[PDB]
Amino acid sequence: LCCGPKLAACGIVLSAWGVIMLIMLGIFFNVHSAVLIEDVPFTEKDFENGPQNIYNLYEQVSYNCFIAAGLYLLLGGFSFCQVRLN
Amino acid sequence: INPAPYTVITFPFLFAVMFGDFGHGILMTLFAVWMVLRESRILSQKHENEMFSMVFSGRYIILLMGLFSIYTGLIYNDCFSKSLNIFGSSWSVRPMFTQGNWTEETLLGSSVLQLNPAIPGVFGGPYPFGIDPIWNIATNKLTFLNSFKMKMSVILGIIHMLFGVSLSLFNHIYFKKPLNIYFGFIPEIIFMSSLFGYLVILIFYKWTAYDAHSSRNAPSLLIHFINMFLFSYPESGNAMLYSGQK
Amino acid sequence: SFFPELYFNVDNGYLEGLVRGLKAGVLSQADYLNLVQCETLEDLKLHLQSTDYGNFLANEASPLTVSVIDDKLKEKMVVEFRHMRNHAYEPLASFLDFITYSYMIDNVILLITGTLHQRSIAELVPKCHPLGSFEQMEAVNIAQTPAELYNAILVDTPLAAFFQDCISEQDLDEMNIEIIRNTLYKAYLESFYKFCTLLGGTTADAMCPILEFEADRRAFIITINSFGTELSKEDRAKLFPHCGRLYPEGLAQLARADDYEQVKNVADYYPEYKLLFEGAGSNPGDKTLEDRFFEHEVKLNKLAFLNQFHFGVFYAFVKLKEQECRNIVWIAECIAQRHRAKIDNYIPIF
Amino acid sequence: GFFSPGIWMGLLTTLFMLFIFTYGLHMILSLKTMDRFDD
Amino acid sequence: NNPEYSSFFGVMGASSAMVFSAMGAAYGTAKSGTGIAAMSVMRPELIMKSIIPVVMAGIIAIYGLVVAVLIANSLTDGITLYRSFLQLGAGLSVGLSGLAAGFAIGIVGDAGVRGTAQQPRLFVGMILILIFAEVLGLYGLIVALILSTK
Amino acid sequence: NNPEYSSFFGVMGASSAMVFSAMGAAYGTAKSGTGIAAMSVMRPELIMKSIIPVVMAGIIAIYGLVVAVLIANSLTDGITLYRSFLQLGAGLSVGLSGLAAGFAIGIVGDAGVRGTAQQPRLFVGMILILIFAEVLGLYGLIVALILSTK
Amino acid sequence: NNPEYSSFFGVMGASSAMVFSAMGAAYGTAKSGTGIAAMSVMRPELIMKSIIPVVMAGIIAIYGLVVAVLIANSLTDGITLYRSFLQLGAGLSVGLSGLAAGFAIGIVGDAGVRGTAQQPRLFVGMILILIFAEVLGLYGLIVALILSTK
Amino acid sequence: AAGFAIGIVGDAGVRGTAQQPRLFVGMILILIFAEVLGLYGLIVALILSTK
Amino acid sequence: NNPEYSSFFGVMGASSAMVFSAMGAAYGTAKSGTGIAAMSVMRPELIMKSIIPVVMAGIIAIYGLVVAVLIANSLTDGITLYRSFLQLGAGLSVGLSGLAAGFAIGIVGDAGVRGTAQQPRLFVGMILILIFAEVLGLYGLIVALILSTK
Amino acid sequence: NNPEYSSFFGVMGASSAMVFSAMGAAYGTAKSGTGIAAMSVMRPELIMKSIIPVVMAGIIAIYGLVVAVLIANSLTDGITLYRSFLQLGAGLSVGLSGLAAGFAIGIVGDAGVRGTAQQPRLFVGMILILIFAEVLGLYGLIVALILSTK
Amino acid sequence: NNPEYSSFFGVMGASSAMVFSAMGAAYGTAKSGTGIAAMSVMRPELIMKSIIPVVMAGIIAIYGLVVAVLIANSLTDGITLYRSFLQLGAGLSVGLSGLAAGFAIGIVGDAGVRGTAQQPRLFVGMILILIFAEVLGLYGLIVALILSTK
Amino acid sequence: MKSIIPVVMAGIIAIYGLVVAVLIANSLTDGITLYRSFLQLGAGLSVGLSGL
Amino acid sequence: LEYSVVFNLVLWIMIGLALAVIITSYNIWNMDPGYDSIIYRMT
Amino acid sequence: TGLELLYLGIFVAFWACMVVVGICYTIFDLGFRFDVAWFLTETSPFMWSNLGIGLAISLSVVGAAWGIYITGSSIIGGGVKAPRIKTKNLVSIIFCEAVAIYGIIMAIVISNMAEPFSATEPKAIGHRNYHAGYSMFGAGLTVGLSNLFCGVCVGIVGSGAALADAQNPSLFVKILIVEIFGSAIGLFGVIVAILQTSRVKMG
Amino acid sequence: FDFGDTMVHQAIHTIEYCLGCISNTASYLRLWALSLAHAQLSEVLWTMVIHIGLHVRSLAGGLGLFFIFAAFATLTV
């Protein structure tokens, strides 16, 4: 019926692969604390006191993957719902 | 000699080394297996897309190709422009580099970089987990990877050529044609074995022989090869790679 | 285009305006309804006098005939073409020289075998088709010598360059006159195509497709026709013009062709002229295949008229005016014959 | 330097003028005659 | 005290004026002369009225001596480097303006003589075009006279 | 206050003057000569009326040559470089005006020769244009001499 | 003291005279000779009369030699920079004037032999044009001489 | 220039002589004129080689 | 401070901005201006629909206006030679973008007007390609706007 | 330490960047539009499909703009001597890459449009070629951006 | 204290290398597209086979890509001024060698186009001669990178 | 298949420039003597255009 | 010494020579000998 | 096409010499020898004022000449069989004359601001003289080229309309409006040139 | 027994065989070129598109990462 599978299978694949690699990336940002070999970029301009606030930033940036993964899962659920409309 | 049993393998690996990427290989195999699952479905299915027909007709190629591509990406430690941190890096620590007559140049390092000269005395050595990830950060990684990849590509090509040419012997013996052996195959193997196996042993010997301590006055394989090819041998100014090689 | 306008208009404004106006000078369709509605030759004179044409039957035979209608149409055509060609300039003058060289070779093949046979040359003069000119000498009063005309026509007549292929004086007797005319038509046609391509402007753009169409159509019709004659397929491919889409592909299948269906398939390789095939009704009171070919010519003539910075407009006017004369004399023919069930073999142009 | 600027002014300006006149000459020679008249 | 070459520029002003005038006039005579020379086999009666393009070309000619003599008799060696460049620019401008006028006029003359050869009706409009060409030349002249002393 | 190299301007003026005179004369003569050669085939009596352009090409040669000798008359090493300016400018200028003239003459002659083939009365129009454009030759020569003496 | 190259502009005058004279004589000879060999086919009995244009091609080359040898005789190490410019202008002048004369001679000679191939009476007009061409050549000669000795 | 004129007049004259053998003499003379031009060139060349 | 006569580059930038738009818009109103007239005889009912490219070429000229008047408004005596470069680049950029747009508009418009003359229903798609041409012109304008306000 | 006015190089860089892209876009548009304008009569159902190449030209125009605005964002007289000519090189790079893309896209559009006019299925291969032209444009952007930020 | 204007022997080298790659590849696609439009009207079974030269239209872009970004990464604030000349060399070297290769690839594409119209077997020879072309581009890459590392 | 031999000779023209380019790369350095670099220029030009 | 105007003089002479030699080369390469009415006998 | 090909030959030769000297500039350590500031400081605004006036009149005149011929010959060729054409189509010639008039108005406006200087020192002398001269030849270039383009466009479109009149004279009603756009191009050049002269003076 | 033709046959075969062996050993370096290609395009597209994931945003970082992510995903495939 509405929004058949022929054009929602792409959404399904994209959502699944996206949740996969963002959970991997969040895991590598909070547990590895985004080691620089894997993630050079960092948002500070003054770190001459110590590495602690850089760690706090590492948790801050790894926090950004939870919203990502969660609403991709929402999009995947909605895509499955569109697919079930037969 | 049917060449199917040899292409069936070597074509995969050569694509894989020409396609040295981990996650891209993963995606290719994912799509390949997706086709594998619905084989009997598509066989009883009518379509007009003819590129699609040529590809599911050759799915046996692409699946194995993708497996080897994933494996090659595992070699190069390049999964989407990044390397997995096994943390086997064995290059630098605080007290060592400060013990190399150095301190607090990072105060000036806000504007400069200060490459470290090699031979610290304690660092180096092999990295069993492939390419050491530290290179991914260094902006001089181009020289390292260029020399590396160029040399291994040349050697792989030499090996493939030398192996592949040998099937003419099977041809010559099966058809009782040693006439193609006498004034043929034998001098062929002679010139190729010399001209390329010599280079192979040269690079192996250089890699096994010289260290960064002897970097000064260290020749290059290029200059030796061109000197040999050109009949030109200077009387001095360039030390041999080994005694008596002239 | 890129070069013209700034340079076209300077020396083509008059001729562009002239071809437009003389397209407008053809008989209106209301005039045509007057033509069909009288069904009499005296009234035919009466109302052709009232249109652009006519008022030319002065000093003519009181029993108006169809041949007089043909002569007056052809006199209007040759008068208009002497008007256009008189005012011209080396490129376009040369173009119109090409437009005339087809009829030149036609009339020249009329002249030949009037002197291999023991016939007068003054006899030949009044019978030449118009535009023939032939004000050049060494070809008249030749004392019935093949070599004299051979040298006369290699030396003096302007189209001598094409006769470099027709040489040795042997083909005059051993070979057919018609085949010679065909070789000359081919060689001239390809030379004309090369000249067009040299002038690489919208002239080339508008004249390439119509020359390819003419080559393709003539190969098409000739291949249809020679299924009842003595000609082999390699001597056949010898005389098909090179300047056609067929030479890439389609000429080979025509060489392989032996009947109506292989040539039908040849038409089917190209949708543009397949449509011209299925219009070959050939019904008594309708049009035939040749008429559909002339119709496609008319469509391409209109397409040439749409563009305005090239030279195919004049060729378009050629083909349209020939069709128009064919229509008017045909109407006169069916008026004299009194057979109104069969007036329908003419194609209105505008 | 490597020239005399004093007359280099006139040189460059006159070259511009002669380039405009070169366009003018390309157009003035773009003329070319006609063939016979129509009667 | 003045910078050198001062008179040289005025001499070029005169030369430029007269050259471009002569080019335009020669163009006019060339094209009109071909038209008249070849057309009059069939309508000889138009020969005595085709002089109009000829004298129109002559008038395009004439714009030379006025400016050229204005240069020639008024040119000296003690110039402040300001006058001489003005005469250079003025001579160039008026000259090639006359060149363009002749570029129009000769070809207008040939097209016109053929047009009147067919039928005498178009002659008045043809001469109308010619007089507008002379007006163009006169525009060039008046700006030359402006720059003569400005 | 006379910069050196002053003889250069005068010599190049006289040179270029007769150079361009020779060019224009060659154009006119060559065109008219081909015309008269291909014409006297069928009417020899037209020679007396087709040779006036040759005379007037000679007149252009005389123009260039009087200019050349006149400029040569006032030439030396240490010229003021203020008269040589006029010499150079005028010498180029009149000669190339002569180019324009004689080129137009030759074109009109090419047309008029064929024009007078079957209709003898076109001699009047031929001469009408022919004197006119050579009066334009004189037109240029006037400024030539005025500057040569200025 | 003496500016550089001051004894060498005459050398290039002689060179240019020879250059343009050689080009001219060669072109005229080629052009006339083509028509001469053409009309020898059907009228070999007028070849001697048709040698005449080539003879004057030789003569105008002699004009070029008169200038060249005089300039060669009027050269030395210590020139005062103005006779050198004089001979430069003289040589290029005469050379190219002979060039244009040879152009006209050649093409009119081809046309004239074409025309006279049916009527030897046209020789008179052919000679008329022909002689006038060397009159032009002589004028170039005269100016070259006066400049070379000025 | 000499070779240019020599080649053209020679081609024309040898083509013309391909019909009439008489032309040979006149053709050669027309060439002689251009070789006289060559003579001139060498004369001035000698002058400047000994000046 | 502001160096000497710092305004120059902007003084030329405004000129380039307007004059290259004068090339583009002139070509645009030329091509369709002639093609529409050619079409009008057969069927006049689509004439105002076919006029659409011409006014759009006018819009290209208007783009030229906006850039030129911006440059002139910012034009002063105290120029830093930074904004002068900005104005020069802006003017050149917008002008030549208008040139490219004018060429595309002219050719596509002639092809489109004859194509619609043959078949009515193609008009809107013709206008689509024409709209694209203006999109390119708009990109030219916005680049010049960025430079005029930097 | 930095030579003054290195920002001029970036100005001309942004200019050239959008310049050559606009050239390519106009080249593609002219050809594609003229191609459709003929054949939409005979295959009107391909009118919808014909938009695919022209928007590709539009992507080229977009690329010109994005590089221009990037350089505008990075433009300043306070450049370290090592960043403005980077803008120049990248601008030239990407602009002429857009030019080459326009060349290829226009001509391939002409070939493929009649290709599909004969046979509808050829569309897929045609689109493949268009994809490739865009891939070329993308590489141009890649290197351009690398130089832009470094 | 390295010389000023040093890094641009790198910037322009990279730009030029990819410039000529962009030219060469686009010409390859040019001829390939015309050829495939020619073939596929009559031989649909050869469409995807004739797409093969199209993939090698892109390798010219790949080689220049490699060299360009190598030069980009190797560029620095201050250079030793011995590597940047190598970059200029290598860039021009590979770029123009690849442009020549692209010419060859397009035209041999046309050759195999005209080849396989009658005989599909020629596909193999087409590809063979096609391999003979890109070896030059790879050769250029060889020497270019030898210089980039010398 | 037997008409590939001229193309083989073209490939030989290809190997030529590579031979000379490698020679130049060998004899190249940073501070060249200033009288070998023009020799490299002329050598490259000569061999390359002879290949042409 | 005082090259600043003599080099301009040499430039003017050189361009004059170039113009002359170019005109002659154009007219000598593309000279138009008629080449008619007998060319067919030799072909 | 040989003559224009030799023209392109000298063009490419000039550019070749340009690149050669440009490279050799930095090869042999030429120390800012092409001092652009020296060039600008050493030039004069006499060139610039006279260039402005002369180019304005020059290019306006030749553009008007183009329009005059194209319209005139189209009209008289069309009138051979349809003499009614001129009675409505001769106005195009008046229009191109008006283009020339606009150009001349700009010429006098530019002549409003020409004067001698007769000064020797460049430094701090005639600072606004340069500015005003730059404005002047800018205005001349703009006006002249704009008038060229109006002229060519008007001429060719006028010819098209003139011979479209031959078949149906009622079409002249809905075709003459094309000239208005080119007139807008002329009046645009006028506006920009006025702004160019609005805020300039020699000092 | 055509001695000359077979001699030339073997001569051309040996010449092409040796020279082709050399050119083929040279041509194997396309592997190196392509490997460089894969590497270089990977890190450059990373540093272009997905590198923008870094930003000081504390709440809308991931939210914009949505369309950034979809963008490079479709592009990279």
Residue numbers in the entry:
A (entry chain f): 5 to 90
B (entry chain a): 389 to 634
C (entry chain d): 3 to 352
D (entry chain c): 413 to 451
E (entry chain g), F (entry chain h), G (entry chain i), I (entry chain o), J (entry chain n), K (entry chain m): 6 to 155
H (entry chain j): 105 to 155
L (entry chain l): 53 to 104
M (entry chain p): 599 to 641
Please give the exact wording used by the authors of the publication that reports this structure.
The synaptic vesicle V-ATPase is an ATP-dependent proton pump that establishes the proton gradient across the synaptic vesicle, which in turn drives the uptake of neurotransmitters. V-ATPases consist of an integral membrane V0 domain (also referred to as Vo) that functions as the proton pump and a cytosolic V1 domain (also referred to as V1) that catalyses ATP hydrolysis. The V1 domain comprises three pairs of subunits responsible for ATP binding and hydrolysis, and its activity is coupled to the rotation of a central stalk in the V0 domain, mediating the translocation of protons across the membrane. The V1 domain reversibly disassembles from the V0 domain in a luminal pH-dependent manner.
We then performed subtomogram averaging and classification, yielding three well-defined states of the intact V-ATPase at approximately 17 Å resolution corresponding to about 120° rotations of the rotor subcomplex between the states. To achieve higher-resolution maps and resolve the binding partner better, we collected a large set of cryo-electron microscopy (cryo-EM) projection images and performed single-particle cryo-EM analysis (SPA) of the V-ATPase. Refinements resulted in maps of the intact V-ATPase assembly, again consisting of three states all at 4.3 Å resolution and a map of the V0-only V-ATPase assembly at 3.8 Å resolution. Unexpectedly, the cryo-ET reconstructions and SPA maps revealed that synaptophysin is bound to the synaptic vesicle V-ATPase. Moreover, further supporting our findings, the V0 domain of the synaptic vesicle V-ATPase was associated with synaptophysin in synaptosome preparations. Together, synaptophysin is the most likely candidate for the binding partner to the synaptic vesicle V-ATPases that we discovered in our in situ cryo-ET and single-particle cryo-EM studies of ISVs. Starting with published V-ATPase structures and the AlphaFold2-predicted synaptophysin model, we refined atomic models of both the intact and the V0-only V-ATPase assemblies in complex with synaptophysin using the wild-type ISV SPA average maps. The luminal parts of subunit e2 and subunit a form an interface with synaptophysin, and electrostatic interactions are involved in this interface. The interaction is identical for both intact and V0-only V-ATPase assemblies, suggesting that this interaction does not appear to directly regulate the hydrolysis mechanism of the V-ATPase. Comparison of the structures shows that the V-ATPase structure is not substantially affected by the interaction with synaptophysin. The confined membrane environment of a synaptic vesicle, including vesicle curvature, probably contributes to stabilizing the relatively small V-ATPase–synaptophysin interface.
